[model samples]
Target chain A: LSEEEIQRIFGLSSEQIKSLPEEXYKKXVEXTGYM
Target chain B: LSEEEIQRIFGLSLPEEXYKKXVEXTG
Candidate 1:
């Protein structure tokens, strides 16, 4: 992502990132074999 | 940033996200 876009993404508060529902990460891992 | 750095950061290829290389075009 461009720096501006990167910032927009990274700009999410730690809590926002971390607070994403477990389902979100769960699907991510399931789809891509990532944790 | 390192490869790992990128993998952890923008590597998330969520369907809602639109990415071209490191540029998100959804904006």
Candidate 2:
């Protein structure tokens, strides 16, 4: 639910984990509760 | 002297800008 909530919050169209830079990727992953 | 000279003008060290993808490829 938390991950889904975050996805909605950011309005992400798809998984951004692999789409962002290293720094941003880590932040998105953590914010999305993937880490 | 125009588009063909961009590489020389910009002093590009790389052959092609398309050859490398930065954090974003949308540009």
Candidate 3:
């Protein structure tokens, strides 16, 4: 997922979060079964 | 953190994605 996607999902501004999609996707997929 | 927050952050549906914010946050 894109950083913008993540921010939209969490209602967080870009500044409130920081990370790459590769890592976020991996962790997200692991926990949620999809990313 | 909350599940809704996690879902929104990742652009995943509540069903398409499942996980607590604490866990997601940790990652």
What lDDT score goes with residue B1 in model 2? 27
Task: Please provide, for model 3 over B1-27, each residue's C-alpha lDDT reduced to its tens digit, 9 standing for 90 to 100.
Answer: 455656565455343233343335446
Query: What value of lDDT does candidate 3 attain over all alpha carbons?
Result: 0.48
TM-score for each of the candidates:
0.25, 0.25, 0.28
lDDT of each: 0.41, 0.36, 0.48
* Cα lDDT, model 2, residue A1: 19
Better of 1 and 3 by DockQ: 1
What are the TM values for chain B, all candidates? 0.35, 0.29, 0.41
Model 3 DockQ (Cα-based): 0.09
Model 1 pairs in collision: A1-B22
Weakest 10 consecutive residues of candidate 3 chain A by summed lDDT: A18-27
The DockQ-derived docking category for candidate 3 is: incorrect
Question: Between prediction 1 and prediction 2, which has the larger lDDT?
Answer: 1
Error of 2 at B15 (Å): 30
Clashes of 2: 0
Query: Which candidate should be chosen as best, given TM-score against the real structure?
Result: 3
Local lDDT at B22 for model 1: 28
Interface RMSD of 2: 16.5
Q: Write the per-residue lDDT of candidate 1 for residues A1-35, one digit (tens) a residue.
A: 44444445444454543433332333334445445
